[PDB]
Design a protein around this motif. Structure first.
Motif, PDB file in Angstrom:
ATOM      1  N   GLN A 159       0.849  -1.190   0.000  1.00 17.25           N
ATOM      2  CA  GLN A 159       0.000   0.000   0.000  1.00 17.25           C
ATOM      3  C   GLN A 159       0.887   1.244   0.000  1.00 17.25           C
ATOM      4  N   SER A 182      -2.448   4.309  -5.775  1.00 21.68           N
ATOM      5  CA  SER A 182      -3.356   5.398  -6.127  1.00 21.68           C
ATOM      6  C   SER A 182      -2.901   6.717  -5.509  1.00 21.68           C
ATOM      7  N   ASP A 199      -4.759  -1.121  -7.735  1.00 21.99           N
ATOM      8  CA  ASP A 199      -5.337   0.209  -7.835  1.00 21.99           C
ATOM      9  C   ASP A 199      -4.223   1.189  -8.177  1.00 21.99           C
ATOM     10  N   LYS A 220      -8.215  -0.850 -11.016  1.00 27.05           N
ATOM     11  CA  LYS A 220      -8.697   0.519 -10.909  1.00 27.05           C
ATOM     12  C   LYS A 220      -7.707   1.486 -11.555  1.00 27.05           C
TER      13      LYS A 220
HETATM   14  C1  LIG Z   1      -6.374   1.878  -2.557  1.00 24.25           C
HETATM   15  O1  LIG Z   1      -6.222   2.649  -1.385  1.00 24.25           O
HETATM   16  C2  LIG Z   1      -7.243   3.606  -1.172  1.00 24.25           C
HETATM   17  C3  LIG Z   1      -6.900   4.406   0.080  1.00 24.25           C
HETATM   18  O2  LIG Z   1      -6.609   3.506   1.130  1.00 24.25           O
HETATM   19  C4  LIG Z   1      -8.608   2.942  -1.011  1.00 24.25           C
HETATM   20  O3  LIG Z   1      -9.597   3.957  -0.962  1.00 24.25           O
HETATM   21  C5  LIG Z   1     -10.770   3.559  -0.217  1.00 24.25           C
HETATM   22  O4  LIG Z   1     -11.806   3.130  -1.084  1.00 24.25           O
HETATM   23  C6  LIG Z   1     -13.078   2.943  -0.499  1.00 24.25           C
HETATM   24  C7  LIG Z   1     -14.062   2.450  -1.554  1.00 24.25           C
HETATM   25  O5  LIG Z   1     -13.563   1.271  -2.148  1.00 24.25           O
HETATM   26  C8  LIG Z   1     -13.563   4.247   0.111  1.00 24.25           C
HETATM   27  O6  LIG Z   1     -14.869   4.094   0.623  1.00 24.25           O
HETATM   28  C9  LIG Z   1     -12.608   4.635   1.222  1.00 24.25           C
HETATM   29  O7  LIG Z   1     -13.007   5.873   1.773  1.00 24.25           O
HETATM   30  C10 LIG Z   1     -11.185   4.734   0.680  1.00 24.25           C
HETATM   31  N1  LIG Z   1     -10.252   4.892   1.781  1.00 24.25           N
HETATM   32  C11 LIG Z   1      -9.589   6.032   1.953  1.00 24.25           C
HETATM   33  C12 LIG Z   1      -8.781   6.159   3.210  1.00 24.25           C
HETATM   34  O8  LIG Z   1      -9.625   6.952   1.136  1.00 24.25           O
HETATM   35  C13 LIG Z   1      -8.886   1.994  -2.173  1.00 24.25           C
HETATM   36  O9  LIG Z   1     -10.013   1.188  -1.902  1.00 24.25           O
HETATM   37  C14 LIG Z   1      -7.686   1.093  -2.457  1.00 24.25           C
HETATM   38  N2  LIG Z   1      -7.938   0.348  -3.674  1.00 24.25           N
HETATM   39  C15 LIG Z   1      -8.351  -0.916  -3.644  1.00 24.25           C
HETATM   40  C16 LIG Z   1      -8.909  -1.464  -4.924  1.00 24.25           C
HETATM   41  O10 LIG Z   1      -8.295  -1.617  -2.633  1.00 24.25           O
END
Ligand SMILES: *[C@@H]1O[C@H](CO)[C@@H](O[C@@H]2O[C@H](CO)[C@@H](O)[C@H](O)[C@H]2NC(C)=O)[C@H](O)[C@H]1NC(C)=O
Ligand SMILES: *[C@@H]1O[C@H](CO)[C@@H](O)[C@H](O)[C@H]1NC(C)=O
Ligand SMILES: *[C@@H]1O[C@H](CO)[C@@H](O)[C@H](O)[C@H]1NC(C)=O
Length: 378
Positions: A159, A182, A199, A220
């Protein structure tokens, strides 16, 4: 000279600032500090002292999350040989001492999320071959050098979201299972052979590279600078791909012919002027988001549309749409287009509200409402 004791070990009300001299943890007799799980409550340690692990030498899980740590004493982890999981997220740590992880051979989980790191010391993870989960999201990192993960040949979850990264080569980590890059500044994405969820949204990616990967299921890529989709042929196992907010000008069926189980395809907010998924429809597709593009004529895509559960066409310049009597749509958006009235009358013989999720409120002079949507007669 405060002495902080446990009460398998929870420290309470530890308060160390930068000024604080040496402090005491646990019992003077080291052998009595045999606790394996260590956490803090209502505590602050602006500098992490060596005294902690000098006294507690059998710790397996160390939770230093949200301790307001700004600096780590150089030798803080000298006697950390037994640590397996280390949590140091939600602090204000500006740098890692070069050999901080020299004596944690059993490390499998490391969390440094939300800190002030701007670079990684050469060799930081060269002695942590067991590392399987690493998070450094919400930092200030600009580059991950290519030797960074040379030793971590079992690294499964990485991450790195929300940094300032212009370079990180994920192809050099073939063990990856989940990867998140991301919210960075990446321009190129090399996808490793076996990653299952990746992602790379919110970057500047314009090129995707890598070998055929049959494991990738969730991809993503929204909010990037992609101009082509041919590389999709290399990911036959995809179930969901998000290509929204890119620079795509057309979508053809060719890149999708090897898709065995693709269910969700998001392509909103691109610059699509052309769509052909009728040459060979994607049999398994359930959700197709084409909203906010520049589509004009899409009716030939009927065979693809007929099989969907969700289709979003709103905010284009579409003139006609045809659906079979037996279509499976449950959610359809149609507003903000350029409908021919006759097409709308035919359409609504087979679909209606609330399956149709939207409507136009007002129409321009040459237009009128037909089943709640603006259209012109011809
Ligand atoms: C990649 O990391 C980001 C940040 O940790 C993740 O963003 C989250 O996504 C969910 C929806 O899937 C949101 O509801 C959350 O609010 C997000 N978290 C934050 C802290 O922003 C993202 O899901 C991750 N990508 C994957 C596919 O796991
Ligand atoms: C990528 O897209 C962003 C957002 O539209 C844009 O600001 C930027 O100029 C693009 N990057 C490049 C290098 O084309
Ligand atoms: C239909 O899809 C839209 C996506 O634009 C969503 O906002 C809405 O909640 C959906 N409606 C139903 C009934 O699920």
């Amino acid at each position: 000279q405060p002495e902080y004791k446990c009460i398998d070990c929870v420290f309470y009300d530890v308060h160390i600032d930068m000024q604080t001299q040496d402090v005491y943890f646990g019992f003077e007799d080291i052998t009595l500090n045999n606790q394996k799980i260590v956490t803090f409550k209502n505590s602050t340690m602006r500098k992490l002292p060596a005294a902690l692990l000098d006294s507690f030498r059998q710790v397996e899980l160390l939770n230093l999350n949200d301790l307001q740590i700004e600096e780590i004493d150089t030798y803080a982890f000298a006697y950390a040989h037994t640590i397996q999981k280390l949590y140091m997220g939600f602090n204000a740590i500006r740098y890692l001492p070069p050999h901080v992880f020299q004596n944690v051979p059993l490390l499998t989980v490391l969390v440094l999320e939300r800190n002030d790191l701007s670079s990684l010391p050469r060799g930081i993870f060269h002695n942590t071959p067991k590392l399987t989960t690493l998070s450094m999201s919400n930092n200030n990192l600009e580059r991950i050098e290519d030797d960074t993960f040379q030793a971590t040949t079992s690294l499964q979850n990485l991450q790195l979201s929300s940094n300032r990264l212009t370079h990180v080569d994920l192809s050099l980590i073939p063990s990856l299972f989940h990867a998140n890059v991301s919210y960075n500044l990446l321009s190129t994405l090399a996808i490793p052979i076996a990653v299952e969820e990746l992602d790379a949204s919110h970057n500047s990616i314009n090129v995707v590279r890598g070998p055929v990967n049959v494991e990738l299921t969730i991809l993503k890529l929204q909010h990037n600078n992609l101009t082509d989709t041919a590389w999709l042929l290399n990911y036959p196992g995809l179930v969901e791909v998000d290509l929204s907010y890119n620079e795509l000008e057309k979508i053809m069926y060719h890149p999708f012919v090897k898709m065995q189980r693709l269910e969700r395809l998001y392509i909103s907010n691109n610059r699509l002027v052309a769509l052909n998924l009728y040459g060979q429809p994607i049999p398994t597709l359930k959700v197709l988001d084409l909203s906010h593009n520049h589509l004009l004529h899409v009716e030939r895509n009927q065979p693809q549309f007929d099989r969907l559960e969700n289709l979003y066409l709103d905010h284009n310049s579409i003139v006609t749409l045809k659906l079979s009597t037996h279509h499976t749509l449950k959610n359809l958006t149609l507003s903000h287009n350029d409908w021919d009235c006759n097409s709308l009358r035919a359409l609504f013989r087979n679909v209606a509200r609330p399956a149709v999720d939207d409507a136009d409120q007002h129409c321009k002079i040459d237009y009128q409402l037909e089943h709640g949507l603006c259209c012109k007669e011809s």
